[PDB]
Amino acid sequence: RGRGAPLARVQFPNMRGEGRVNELFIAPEGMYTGQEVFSGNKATLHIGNILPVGNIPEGTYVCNVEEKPMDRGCLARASGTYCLVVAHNMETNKTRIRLPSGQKKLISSKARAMIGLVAGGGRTDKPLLKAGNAYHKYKAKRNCWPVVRGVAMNPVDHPHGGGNHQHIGVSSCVPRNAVPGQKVGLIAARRTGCSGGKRR
Amino acid sequence: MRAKWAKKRMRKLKRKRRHMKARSK
Amino acid sequence: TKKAQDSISLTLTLVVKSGKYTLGTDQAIRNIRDGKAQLVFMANNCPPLVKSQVDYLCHLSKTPVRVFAGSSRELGIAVGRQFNVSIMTILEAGDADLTSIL
Amino acid sequence: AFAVCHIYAGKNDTFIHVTDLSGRETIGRVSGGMKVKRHCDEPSAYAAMQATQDLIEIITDRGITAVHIKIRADGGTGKRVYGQGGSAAIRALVRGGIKIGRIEDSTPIPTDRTRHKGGRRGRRL
Amino acid sequence: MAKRTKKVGLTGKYGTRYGRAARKQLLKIETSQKAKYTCPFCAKDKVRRTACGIWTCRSCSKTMAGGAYSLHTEPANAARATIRRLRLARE
Amino acid sequence: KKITQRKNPDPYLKKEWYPVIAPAHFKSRHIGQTPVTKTAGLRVATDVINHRVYEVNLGDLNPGAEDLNGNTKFYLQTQLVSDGKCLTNFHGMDITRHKYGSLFRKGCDCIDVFMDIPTTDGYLLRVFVIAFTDRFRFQRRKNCHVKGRVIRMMRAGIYETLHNELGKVSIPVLVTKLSNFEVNAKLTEALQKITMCRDVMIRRVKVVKRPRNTMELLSTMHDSNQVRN
Amino acid sequence: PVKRRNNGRSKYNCGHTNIVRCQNCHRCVPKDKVIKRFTIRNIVDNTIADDVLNACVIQGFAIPKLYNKVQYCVSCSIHNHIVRVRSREDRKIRTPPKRNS
Amino acid sequence: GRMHSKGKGISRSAIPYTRAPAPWNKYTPEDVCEQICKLAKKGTPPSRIGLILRDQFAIGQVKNVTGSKIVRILKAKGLAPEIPEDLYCMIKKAVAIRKHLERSRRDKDSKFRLILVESRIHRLARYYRQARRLPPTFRYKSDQAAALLA
RNA sequence: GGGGACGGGUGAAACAGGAUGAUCCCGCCGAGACCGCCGGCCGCGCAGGCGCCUGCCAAGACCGCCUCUGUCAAUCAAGGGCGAAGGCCGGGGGCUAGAAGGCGAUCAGACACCACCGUAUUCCCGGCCGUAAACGGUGCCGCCCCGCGGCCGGCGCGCGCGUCCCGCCGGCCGCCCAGGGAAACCGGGAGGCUCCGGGCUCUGGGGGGAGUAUGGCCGCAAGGCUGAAACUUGAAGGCAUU
Fold first, then answer.
1. Nearest CA to G82 among G66, G67, G70?
2. For C6, phi and psi rounded to 5 degrees?
3. Domain Large ribosomal subunit protein uL2 C-terminal, which positions (chain A) (predicted)?
4. Which among A29, A111, A117, H150 could bridge A82 via Cys, Cβ 3.0 to 4.6 Å?
5. What's the CA angle centered on E46, arms E40 and E51, to 5 degrees?
6. H96 in C contact zone (CB under 8 Å)
7. Cα(F78)–Cα(F89) distance, integer angstroms
8. Structural domain of H135
9. Residue H118 domain-assigned?
10. Which of residues 49-88 of F touch strand I (CB under 7 A)?
């Protein structure tokens, strides 16, 4: 209900008992009902398989990556979000990965990840279009819509508050050490405004 | 390039003339 | 490479024109079991349970089984039919199939 | 006592610097610009002549009896001709008594280069 | 025929409301979601979108993960090829 | 070598000079002296000079044969500081810039191939080679240009000579093969059957990857003079 | 009228050609129009070459000679006298003046 | 010159002035016709069977020996191809160009070639229909072209 | 890591960079463009255009041919596709260069050229645009066409024999005899044409007004395509000579 990404019920054998365990996995694009998936140090290299990040070759797109080994899923678990394997330090057993923000983190090669890019990709591309398709969207998630702008609220409800004209009246940028009730504007803003060429 | 600069002035006048036409449409 | 690909295309066309051929799995298994089959051509798209079952009956009747590129539609286009054709059996061939074991 | 002197010639200023064979540690450095007050005179060989004379005293104090010569222009997308002070740089060292070892071009020439300043019409001076 | 002359073909429902830019983007996104993509296994163009991220062949009955408004997204298709070329290289 | 013995400038008021020695295959092993700041808090001088890269000419490395291969240079990187003397391993080779320029001419076709070779040891190296065409003796026309069939055949040929020459040999064998110019020679004989060719020389060979701690490889490279083989 | 039948460009069967740059102007000129000279000259000044060679500790080390190609635009070349405005009859000659150095 | 190309090349076979069985000929007209049928059973396109007779055997021109052209001989035995071979070869070329284009929508040059080959198919087809070699019903369908090959 | 006062820039300068150690040297990494020298009277392509490596995929002209077909052809309103750059609209990415924008010199002014910084853009992907001095300022198919040279491909003849000699065909070119033109010049045509007729499409009819007005269509726009008149005027133009 909450996720815009499909989840897949994959049934593995139970090594401890006689049962077949059912595990809910993020479904990478192309996973098909009936697909056989292999998990482990000796796992193969097909979209779907879960194998230690070190084992996966550099350049592969991988999803549901583990920040630290045996965390059972941590990074790249949203729609169309993938993590790229940048490099493998053999001496430090540390593997660099580009998270879907661009930022690079070093992860123990022992950590696990799933080969593939998560499904439901290109979802943001569709305009929501109506307020109603937004209401139906956040019903599944928390009560965080509709949003009232703070400059519409009276002085007592929001720090932006209300005067004879709707204005913030003070710099939106607020200090990092602002107390709980004070942090309402843009926080720790290194820069503000639409400039361009921001790749520098 | 006087011919080029002349067609830029014609294009400017044609933009202003069409915009003024629209105000009174 | 494509010199051979043309030969496979010309054998299929000439079998369709002259010779007896069966389109589909139910017809294929019935013929393979009775040994009517001379060659079996299977599309890559054929289901992976069907592929392993035909392969065994073909081993039992000692009848060669080959994979035709991929997609039943592609086999279908080569047999000249719009409907998909997973398994084509060559019972008899108007153009000798030297590519029986291509 | 072999060492290598990399001589930037280029234009605008002349850099005469003697270093270890690795290039990691600089035995000595001097610039044509330091010697001349006027900015235009900085690439000129007279400024450079006074300049490598000063460097010779510092380098010969630190051994460096023999040097190898690597000379480079602006290179990259600019000039590719050594320019002014480069000819003086070997000559002044020869006056000093430093012994030449091998001479080479260190121009940073570009395979498939990036665009250079000026525009299609060029510097319309 | 030609009931609607312009790209208002699937956007006739939205009416005058929503603006041309929105509708223009929807005309491409909704045309693809409604369309029947080919089944990788069925080999029939009967795959249809059951839900965002879920596309089901109406012949095989197989359900396959895919993009929200298209069975195969271009980034996934590139990765599918990259993974195949990297596996065959590691073999 | 001046500061350790006596007075030199403020930086070199506390500095040392360490002898640098090249591999066994070369006639004059000593390369030169390295300036290095004396031992400090974490900056142990020997650790500081562990990975310095020297550029030696083959004429300097193997003197008395300067006229041949005066252009060819070898980049060598220290791997060990034993005996107060830096011991270096081969990390790169390139022909000089003055020669690279003299290699190209109008009315000639240039073939450059890059082929990364996994050696019989740990090192992985890319061999960059160059070849040019030359006028046949009769030459009614003035241009040494060849049809595509010669171009493809010749480039296929170059890869093959490296395949059966530098493809499966260890780094000490490679150093002897690039120094005596043996592998460069092999491409020419193969090319000579294929066409009229000039300048068929391996221009550059770079260390793409180094097996960690090639100390054992530096024993064979430096002190296996007895195993010259 | 047509001052030059080659139209100022050695462009035949081409339609479009690659682009190059005036060394000093940094102008953009089509490759066909560019003057294009190849100059091979000593790395050191020829006047100082003999002394440098004698000082060169290396036995039989030839002085390295720089090999470079200089390309200028028509405007750039006329000012730098790389090529000279010539009479209508003299334009038709295509042979280098006073006989590449 | 070529209809869709600006080339003016002239590589043309020139048939012999004297239309006669070769002096070294040792075969009857019926013998050649019986041989032709065997190659027709093999499915070899009519141009190829003429090349085979000229190179594998030594009949330079079929009209010179048999007294009829190869396609006329095929028609007599009803071993003629349903589509005249010339149209079939362009239709097959169009099918391959379409297949390559289906993988690549960015090959703008390939689309250009497809328009010309398809235009040639349409132009030739109209002539065959007027001649009555092919049915008035014939129409070129890109969708059915691959099936038409069979 | 090094070593120690400037560095950039220029026509001279000045601004921004330097003891928070710059410039400079050496290794190392990241990022994106871009295919250097070979590279052209080289070539390919329908033009626009096209140059790293290894593949992969369909092509294309040309030549060779005693292969097949038997007028299936030519040129083309409408109609369809393609179309440098800049621009646009959704997505990326972002080094460099860089319209705008900011600065620093100059000058009477400079707000322009030259320097410095820098956004859109350049690059990619899906669309749109539909224009260039898009030129070779020369439509296309057809024939005849005077010799002399080069170059590219295919083929043939001959001999010492070599990427030789001589052709042929298709191109890419230079010089020209005739001829032509108002000439400049074309001469593989701009020749064979006042002794004017091979075929077929497009456009032009003194200079402005004016590619404007208005109407239509097309475009998200920018604009494109079509397109006047009233009126004014005795010149406008080409190529050569001094």
1. G70
2. -60, -40
3. 45-180
4. A117
5. 90
6. no
7. 6
8. 81-150
9. yes
10. 51-53, 75
H66 shares a domain with H130: no
Provide DSSP, F16-85: EEEEEE--TTSS--EEEEEEEEPP-SS--HHHHTTT-EEEEEHHHHSTT--STTSSEEEEEEEEE-GGGS
CA distance linking residue G11 with residue E9, whole number of Å: 51
Structural domains of chain H, count: 2
Tokens at E69, concatenated: 């408004």
Cross-chain residue pair E29–A8, CB shorter than 8 Å:
no
Do H108 and H150 lie in one domain? The reply is yes
Query: Which residues in chain F have their CB less than 8 angstroms from residue G64's CB?
Result: 96-98
How many Å apart are CA D103 and CA D89, to the nearest integer? 12
Q: Do H58 and H91 fall within a single domain?
A: no
In a domain, H120, yes or no: yes
Q: What is the C-alpha to C-alpha distance for residues E69 and E48, in angstroms, rounded to an integer?
A: 10
Q: Measuring from the CA of residue G32 to each C1', which nucleotide is nearest? A: I40
**Exposed/middle/buried for residue G45 (C-beta within 10 Å: 0-12, 13-18, 19+):** middle
Q: State whether the beta carbon of D34 lies below 7 angstroms from any atom of strand I.
A: yes
Count CB-CB contacts under 10 A for residue G87.
7
Give the residue numbers of the binding site of H for Mg(2+).
7
Angle between helices F182-194 and F171-179 (to 10 degrees): 60
Q: What is the CA C23 to chain-centroid distance, rounded? A: 8
E43 burial (CB, 10 Å; 0-12 / 13-18 / 19+) is: buried
Residue H142 lies in a domain: yes
Is the N-terminal amide bond of A146 cis, ω within 30° of 0? yes
Q: Is A88 helix (H, G, I), strand (E, B) or coil?
A: strand
Residue with tokens 């048939």, as numbered in its chain = H15
Which residues 79-98 on chain A approach chain E with CB closer than 8 angstroms?
Answer: 79-80, 82
Cβ neighbours around G57 below 10 Å, total: 13
A59 contact partners, CB below 8 Å, separation of at least 6: A84, A85, E82, E86
Q: What is the amino acid identity at position H41?
A: K
Judgement on whether residues H86 and H150 belong to the same structural domain of the protein:
yes
Answer yes or no: are the C-beta atoms of F27 and F63 closer than 8 Å: yes
Q: Is residue H18 part of a domain?
A: no
Angstrom distance (rounded) from CA C95 to CA C7: 10
CB atoms within 10 A of CB H144: 11
Residues H142 and H95 occupy one common structural domain: yes
DSSP state letter for H24: T
Is any Cβ of chain H less than 8 angstroms from the Cβ of C3? no
Report the SS3 class of residue F169. Answer: coil
The 10 Å Cβ neighbour count of residue F199 is 21
Q: In terms of residues, how long is chain D?
A: 125
H/E/C letters for each residue in C5-55?
Answer: HHHHHHHHHHHHHCCCEEECHHHHHHHHHHCCCCEEEEECCCCCCHHHHHH
CB contact under 8 A, F98 and G68: no
CA A43 to chain centre: 25
- Output the six-digit token pair for B5: 């600069």
For F153, the token pair is: 């055949």
Please indicate, yes or no, whether residues H102 and H144 belong to a single structural domain of this protein.
yes
- Chain H CB contacts of C80 under 8 Å are 147, 149-150
What is the nearest nucleotide to H105, using C1' and CA? I126
What whole-number distance in Å separates Cα of residue A66 and Cα of residue A57?
16
Q: Smallest CA–C1' separation from F206: which nucleotide?
A: I27
- Burial of residue D47, with CB atoms counted within 10 A of its CB: 0-12 exposed, 13-18 middle, 19 or more buried: buried
| Experimental method, per PDB record | cryo-EM
In the block, which residue shows the tokens 């102007």?
G25
Distance between CA atoms of residues D2 and D89, nearest Å:
18
